[PDB]
Design a protein around this ligand. Sequence first.
Ligand SMILES: Cc1ncc(COP(=O)(O)O)c(C=O)c1O
Ligand SMILES: Cc1ncc(COP(=O)(O)O)c(C=O)c1O
Lengths: 385, 386
Amino acid sequence: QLPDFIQNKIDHYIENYFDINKNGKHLVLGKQASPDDIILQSNDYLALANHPLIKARLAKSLLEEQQSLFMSASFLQNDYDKPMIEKRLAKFTGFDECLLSQSGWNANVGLLQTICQPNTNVYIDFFAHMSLWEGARYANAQAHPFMHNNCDHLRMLIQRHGPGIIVVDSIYSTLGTIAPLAELVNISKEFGCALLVDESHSLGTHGPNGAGLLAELGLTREVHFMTASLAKTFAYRAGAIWCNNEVNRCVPFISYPAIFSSTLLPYEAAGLETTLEIIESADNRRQHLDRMARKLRIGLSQLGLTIRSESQIIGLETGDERNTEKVRDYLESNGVFGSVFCRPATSKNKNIIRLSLNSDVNDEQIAKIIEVCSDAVNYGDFYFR
Amino acid sequence: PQLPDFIQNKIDHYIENYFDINKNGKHLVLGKQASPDDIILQSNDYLALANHPLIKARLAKSLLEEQQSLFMSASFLQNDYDKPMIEKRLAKFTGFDECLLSQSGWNANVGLLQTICQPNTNVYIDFFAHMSLWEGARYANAQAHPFMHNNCDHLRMLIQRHGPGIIVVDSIYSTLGTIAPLAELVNISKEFGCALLVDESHSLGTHGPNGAGLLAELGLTREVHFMTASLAKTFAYRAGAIWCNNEVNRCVPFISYPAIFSSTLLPYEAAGLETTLEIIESADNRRQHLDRMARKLRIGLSQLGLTIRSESQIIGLETGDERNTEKVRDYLESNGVFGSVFCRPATSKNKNIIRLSLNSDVNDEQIAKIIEVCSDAVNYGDFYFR
Ligand SMILES: Cc1ncc(COP(=O)(O)O)c(C=O)c1O
Ligand SMILES: Cc1ncc(COP(=O)(O)O)c(C=O)c1O
């Protein structure tokens, strides 16, 4: 057992976050899924996790003679030490330079540490990813949250607070909405602002050969920074920073997680190249996903639910905790497993049960989700928003 | 597309005062390129397991099995049937109650501190404690109170002044190789009703019975509240772990931001760690060898009149200012010895370290050569040593 100043916090937490739930667990933890159940919890959009060629390429490079490169990524910043995958990924998205990181989180935290000073203006969408808020808070930037995809509010804020960095998800993790990138590019140009787009949820699923949403819209050359977790479509535990400028020569010596935390091992980079080749040609998978996503969005919204989504991420709005619990349990009972997003990913009264669709989902399964929600809507134990 | 000036400012000033001010036009950590026959002492893989055929075998095998698509937060994986076996076994290995996996050692410490701190929680931290510990506390808005390196008297005053808090240390320090007074710190922990957090990143696997670490060696396991480690040192893997002698690991996966918003380790990674743990548990031979070689180097170098604070496989050469450090590095590299430059923000500007990290594949001959090269450096070298 523990001294009071920690224990008090730990008792309170357990009481207000575990004990209050019908199952005694934290709200995200439901029951165990069957193999027959529809699992919509994974960020692996193109269902690549178990792809034979990717597995083969990693195992192969894993079995080669690994040189003992257990140290920071900064010690490996010479051209000969810099992996082929960065050059290819840069080429892929159309950005100048690409830098590998240990995760999407670290890419965001790192980039924001490099370009920010205390009280730097950071104009960040209300619903942008936590990695981005925390990036900015670590750097002691001045956060100026703006209302979701609301360009008028952003205009007011910049005009009020001066030039800064405008930070957005291209596709938002909780809601599946799409940022207004064309208008956001105009705005940054107009006010002398830097623009940072986190493409974690569009990279691979969107754009030509899956090069992303900036690449789809034709905006690549008009943006300063893009970051992305490689743990979504790229199905790998890593991240990347892209620059249309020379910031990537500096990140490795300034970012604390790049300086003080160990780099990706050489065999990990070769795993990604194969993945890239597979993503690059997965037009069918990209298109199937897009079809199913829409079919699900249409069917759910017509039942009266707010489906803000315009993508493969679909957020059922379930309100308060007690309600969310009731919705989770009902869905799971009927073989539908989404992921509870509660605090601090959300406000405590605007919970989301997120459905991450992937290219392996079929029409029959889409039909089932709709029907389950349609039955929900008349069972009488809960509400949607 | 043009960067606004308040960015370009910082970048231009950085490239200038950090790349351009250096002889070879690159950052101070980048020397000349090493070759085959040089002696490399930069790796953290102290038991030289990186290339171990059995680890590579088990890892490849595990990856080839059918993967269920687990690309999500570890939050969603905290049901007992989702929790990996490596935790139970890592716990049992160190003697700690519960163990929790993390994506890095850095995250390990951030996660834990965010869980146990409230704003204005006293954190008595060693000056030389790892950056991850400082930042861990700073992200949790804790009151951080720095005590002088390995100084119990200083620590005592601070606690008397500000009250009960968390005492935070490395067991073996990352830039100096020094060893904390763990026994004494446990006393103070008791003398003032505090909690103790030890990072064993550089002792775990190299020290204790079967490499269970320094706390296990000194039999302090049951009286320490928290331990953490990077698995990227001796364990030769990109991951982290948090051990607790209490219920804290029940909450970390749901409170810690790195644990909520960053993807988990994939199941096959966990498997590869089990095999590492087995190998380490039996690697008495390599631990004994590495202990002896380190001792030779420490003794060897001190005789030259050098400050060697070290008591472990990590030896820190103290090179003072940046200009000088560049000289010592260029000299040591010229004669076949490759350490790691440790400059700011890892050190204060005028107190740089070149860090020689030993491993179990270093032999007598190489030690003799490292000692010999440092002798020449002490004598004919156009530079000093703090
Ligand atoms: C004492 C200590 N703790 C934690 C870490 C961070 O480890 P990781 O690279 O796994 O994040 C290190 C540095 O690498 C370390 O020296
Ligand atoms: C928009 C967004 N950015 C960043 C991340 C963090 O990525 P990672 O898991 O690789 O740290 C995620 C969440 O996983 C995300 O959804």
